[PDB]
A paper describes a structure:
Type 2 TDases have thus far been predominantly identified through soil functional metagenomics with one sequence found in the soil-derived human pathogen Legionella longbeachae. These two types differ in their resistance profiles, with type 1 enzymes conferring resistance to all tetracycline antibiotics including third-generation drugs while type 2 enzymes are generally limited to only first- and second-generation tetracyclines.
Tet(56-2) and Tet(56-3) are most closely related to Tet(56), at 87.4% and 87.9% amino acid identity respectively, and have 88.6% amino acid identity to each other. Tet(56-2) and Tet(56-3) were also identified in the genomes of Legionella species: L. clemsonensis and L. massiliensis, respectively. The FAD-interacting residues are conserved between both structures. Most residues in the FAD-binding pocket and the substrate/inhibitor binding pocket are conserved across the three Legionella Tet(56) structures. Similarly, the addition of 1 μg/mL anhydrotetracycline reduced the concentration of tetracycline required to inhibit the growth of Tet(56-3) producing E. coli four-fold, from 32 μg/mL to 8 μg/mL. Apparent IC50 values for anhydrotetracycline inhibition of Tet(56-2) and Tet(56-3) were in the low micromolar range (0.3-30 µM) for tetracycline and doxycycline inhibition. Together these results suggest that anhydrotetracycline inhibition is a promising combination therapy against bacteria producing Tet(56-2) and Tet(56-3).
Residue numbers in the entry:
A (entry chain C): 3 to 387
B (entry chain A): 5 to 90, 97 to 387
C (entry chain B): 5 to 89, 100 to 387
D (entry chain D): 2 to 89, 98 to 387
Write the structure that this text describes.
């Protein structure tokens, strides 16, 4: 199985499928557009059947070792006055094998699992073509490589999806919200605490977990505005500075340190709707194919499942990408629908701030806990040895 | 450090192993669709046996050694003139079997067949390679191990910088069905500056034919197999003996090989980020009997000098050329020394012939140990 | 988990590899001072060939396979009568490969167990040098004459069956200058062979004969050679030249063709594998293949039981019973006509041989191997 | 590889450390522990000097950094609880228990038998006879003791003429209790009358670690009798005040009680035949040196390395081991004595003088921690 396979994107789906592809006898090559591993991102939750895959890969103990250590959580008003304080109650109500871990720590654990897999950074594809025999990949530095299969794991803004799929074959659905997170110097000397302030359909957060020198800032807000270019960091940062102008609290102290952050992340809360995630010798995995959006809390787990099934089906098809890709599209269909529908469900209430009572709030919260456990296990994983 | 190695013969695979063991990540290509296993018996000799032991393949090679029990020199009619019945100085092993052993040591290294380069450029930062299938790849280093007719040397070095010297003789060998039911025996017939051999060793169904003759003729296109075979037939048109029985089975052969006995002469074997190893740089010719050994030493030293220099190819390449020079000269000079009498068939005393044979065996023994290997641990 | 494997033959090394591959840390002991590489050509066949593949030695076994190119049957005066022109490998070569596969497993030599006891917690093993060790499990692979079987199992729980024949084989210098040939001479229900495979300096001699006699002490080497010389006193041909060179041979082997019949091969925390539990005898040609399967299944069942030997040993006996019966019975089937020399033509003999080839292939695949990762 | 039968006694720091390096070098050791589970007691330790390089080559440095102590505030208080002072080179501070855990996770491929202990040892020129508590008799090519200051193996193998235990005039005790004060990432300490009482919390919010250190020339009738230890500790702190009675009341709820005199082991050599002492069993530099764990690191490294360098020839290996460690043991043991000249002496001095003594202590331990150049065994 010396089949040439290209995997685009050193995020979560990308590194995960590289491990499984190698474990099943294939020889993948991994590329990343940025000069180094992007370890940004808020805390993620490895949950449901994804924990089972994590245990199979042999990383579940590492993930448990690098789990979030926040000891206290405070919601405050714009004056800093405490309204609600928690000390870990949130984690009790949740699923059993769920583990919360900062995204970059999870990516680092995944990158250590594929140290024997080639990985080239600062590598950008400019165009892709394919025929019955091979895929042609053209790189910005002048290289032209031929591959038997190409797998895209470059995120919801997948440039591969745009180079391979027509506009009539994929739809991006805006859920009326935006998310941003970045690390800054811990100017508040916070220790194992998360502070959040919600007002006027906006949320501002700042936390400290392990590194006492660094704090992670977070912004979430409702909006239907669309950027001229969702990939222009300068427009992203200006839009964030304008929406949170006059919010008060620690917003300006946070945004003033935004320029010295090395892990900036900003995106719209969006979903990718496709009838198929494969075209010829090219397959999409993770957010590139079926992003459930941050509001589902399931993007990383769907990345895990999609990587395992695609690599497994290729093993079961003895390299017949025609059959594997077809089974891949079918097996993941119910799981994608459950998770994406859950995400839309959450968006109906997210930051709405409708004047509801504790009864209404507790019912939505408990129904979210039940709904997310069923969704996280909405599929039974096959076996491939 | 991305490294391309060109040619899956002896030098190529062997340097892939030594680059991998020293930490590098080589990639190998081969022009032909499958590994080429043709060739006559070769000898792993001298300091090259030490390299083989360090590679962990010495026992395997010994296990695959030739097992010819009898060697008969015969006249054109079949009458036996001379008969013979024949160490860690030397292990004789058919070329194909040694190639197989080398390949099995680099199963973790990617090897791409039916792949050949049409253009090669380099700057101070990388080498750019354009392949026949339209691919373009950048490499930190390119090591050419594509043999005497190396296209890489032709595209990188000017006509001024290399010279191919014809030693006035030709070689051809191929396997045919063992129609004579030979068993661990080699039959040879020499006459009129020509030699015809046929042997059976390890596969009872297969016999290996061999032709060697003196000639100062040069083919119009040495790459044309049709010309090669036509020239071979014209040269042995009426040699007699089993010549026709052998040539008529040539079309059934899967491993036909034919070439002139040639040496490659260069003052340096490197240019920028591109280095040559094996026959592509310093072919000692079949008449030296040391090509594969000089390929082992060339691979081991080049990989080691890249390790000792921490990837500074400038340092490693200069060290490479210097350390290899005395070993190349001794082996090429021995090759030419052999060609002075090869198939000349001068009327000499049986004592003289025996004496020149003793001197040849003594000379190759010393030549095969002409340098001390550096240690790279 | 402390696990003791007794015997560095074929079954022993095989189960050590598998136990290690499944997470255990076995220890291997051997009665003799060094590994015993004696023996004639054996055949890896049937499901055993798949286990060899999963162990990563199949190609190694192929590389060291036999290379005999001609077989001649000859009369006592040297005149040829007949001439002829899955992997066959000499026992010593296969034992080499298996020992290379367990370089991470300790092997202590010159070790002899003298007493064995067990309770529901551990097995206690007494050694001749005075050591006393407790083990969670003890696995016996000490061959047909298993001292462990005799110490653990009552005389009514096992039966030794003599198949009425003997076998001896040893390597001597190649004084005849044989090259890749096997010369055999059959007469009076006795067979004498001498072959040369690869090493041109050595020839391997073989002796086989029918007999109902039993030795006073089957492990006494002097009585073995006396019985051998008396049996071939006036056979003629090369018997004297071969037997006169026994003293310079370093790998003398002699044994009776025997089987071991048991209803169960485990007792508490002790398990038998290989010839010690279900020896099918040389006439079956499946001893080494039965060693492979026993080692594979026993280790696998232990892994699946997460160390619970009660479940593993129960499944070990259950899964192996069909395979053992077929191979043991196949061996008895061969003995009824082995060296008997019935009055039939060569078309009948070659007909029986064709039946044997079909039968042995079915028997060598007479079970389906479970999977354990 | 090597399949020499090697027994390593003691699952602390030196023991697990040497099991790793022996296996890395081609050996197959076996580990035993007297107690039924791994002992994770003890105060914070410092991985320092050349011991940091050994930890890096073991691939545990980041794990050690990951579990580094994270006390945010340190308050020194009087017997009434009033705060008198509040505090806010590749070396890492880490609780001893967490370092033992890490080390046991680097030897997961080596057998480790708990509730195992030796009753007697014999040896001849061919093997060592180790007789076990559960009735086993085993022969070993090499036996390596890492069973601590009161090494039962040393007392079985070495005569009282070959080792000397030096009392440095002080005693130490530490044990975990329920965090009845509800402390978080803080260390509370109180010193008076040549006694020091501490109580802190770092990671487990339900558990606090108590500390006791005092000066005394008294010697226990039997140093291994816990009852005499605690009776001595309670009588020493009878009228101390502060939290001493609260802490010592919760002693019976502790699972990791540690009590010991601050002592050193003085031997001319650390080997006899096929038996070798490593760690505190041979050259314990005392807690006042702050180097026991690091000396255990270097001892395990050099003994294992010299055995590989001599291809299992214990005669040659034991000779290099004794010679090479001598200068390092000398500097660390001497530094521990030097600390004891001022430890808890409480001399009337300026805060400039006390500061100067601390600066000198830090500069000295820096050099003592790098007092030898490590050999390379590749
Ligand atoms: C830096 C970062 C921070 C994030 N933070 C959050 C967060 O706080 N909350 C949340 O819910 N989700 C976040 N996400 C998204 C989250 O990772 C995904 O929703 C999901 O968990 C994993 O999906 P994925 O691995 O398929 O895609 P991603 O995690 O988005 O990974 C895609 C990877 O491909 C790389 N890439 C993109 N384009 C190219 C290209 N042309 N060539 C090569 N490589 C390319 C990207 O740099 C990235 O490393 C973040 C993603 C990133 C990259
Ligand atoms: C099929 C064959 C048979 C031979 N038979 C004999 C013999 O009988 N006697 C003798 O003395 N010597 C023989 N030789 C030459 C002998 O192997 C060499 O003299 C020496 O032993 C090894 O040198 P080398 O590995 O550098 O070159 P070679 O052994 O010649 O190996 C060169 C390899 O590079 C490949 N190659 C060539 N051009 C290209 C290209 N443009 N791109 C990619 N790959 C390329 C070739 O297919 C071959 O696999 C033979 C070589 C070959 C290839
Ligand atoms: C030297 C030798 C030569 C053989 N030659 C042939 C042959 O030519 N043809 C044939 O059909 N079969 C032969 N056999 C038997 C053959 O190996 C088996 O039938 C089968 O292939 C493998 O069975 P086994 O590994 O269970 O037992 P064996 O191969 O017999 O191995 C048993 C091992 O246990 C050891 N052992 C015995 N008693 C003790 C003890 N008390 N303590 C510790 N270790 C002990 C033995 O020394 C031996 O190493 C031979 C066996 C041996 C040992
Ligand atoms: C529970 C405990 C707490 C400690 N607390 C401190 C502290 O607060 N401050 C300080 O400076 N030092 C402390 N030490 C000592 C410190 O670990 C050493 O100074 C050094 O760090 C490591 O030396 P070592 O591993 O050689 O010895 P140790 O750390 O003492 O390790 C000895 C090990 O051997 C085991 N053992 C003892 N006798 C036997 C036997 N007969 N059979 C089998 N195993 C046996 C012990 O249970 C222990 O696991 C403590 C040691 C222990 C065991």
């Amino acid at each position: 199985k010396n089949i040439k396979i290209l995997v685009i994107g050193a995020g979560i789906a990308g590194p995960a499928i590289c491990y499984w592809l190698r474990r099943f006898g294939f020889s993948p090559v991994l590329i990343e557009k940025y000069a180094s591993i992007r370890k940004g991102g808020q805390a993620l939750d490895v949950r449901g059947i994804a924990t089972h895959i994590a245990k199979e890969m042999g990383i579940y103990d590492q993930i448990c070792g690098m789990r979030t250590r926040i000891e206290c959580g405070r919601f405050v008003d714009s004056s800093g006055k405490v309204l609600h304080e928690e000390h870990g109650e949130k984690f009790g109500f949740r699923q059993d094998d769920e583990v919360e871990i900062v995204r970059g720590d999870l990516v680092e654990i995944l990158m250590k699992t594929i140290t024997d897999i080639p990985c080239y950074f600062n590598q950008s594809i400019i165009s892709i073509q394919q025929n019955s025999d091979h895929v042609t990949v053209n790189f910005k530095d002048g290289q032209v490589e031929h591959y038997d299969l190409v797998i895209a794991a470059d995120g919801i803004h997948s440039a591969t999806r745009r180079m391979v799929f027509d506009k009539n074959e994929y739809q991006l659905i805006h859920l009326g919200a935006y998310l941003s997170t970045f690390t800054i110097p811990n100017y508040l000397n916070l220790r194992h605490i998360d502070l959040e302030c919600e007002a006027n359909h906006k949320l501002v957060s700042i936390n400290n977990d392990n590194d006492p020198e660094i704090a992670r800032a977070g912004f979430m807000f409702l909006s239907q505005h669309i950027l001229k270019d969702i990939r222009d960091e300068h427009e992203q940062k200006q839009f964030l500075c304008d929406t949170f102008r006059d919010f008060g609290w620690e917003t300006q102290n946070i945004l003033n340190r935004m320029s010295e952050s090395d892990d900036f992340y900003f995106d719209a809360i969006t979903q990718v709707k496709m009838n198929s995630w494969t075209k010829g010798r090219i397959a999409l995995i993770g957010d590139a194919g079926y992003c459930p959006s941050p509001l589902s809390g399931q993007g990383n787990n769907l990345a895990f499942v999609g990587a395992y099934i695609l690599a497994g089906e290729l093993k079961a098809a003895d390299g017949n990408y025609m059959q594997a890709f077809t089974r891949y599209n079918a097996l993941l269909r119910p799981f994608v629908d459950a998770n994406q529908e859950f995400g839309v469900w959450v968006s109906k209430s997210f930051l709405v701030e409708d004047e509801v009572s504790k009864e209404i709030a507790e019912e939505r919260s408990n129904r979210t806990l039940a709904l997310i456990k069923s969704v996280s296990n909405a599929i039974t994983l096959p076996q491939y040895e």
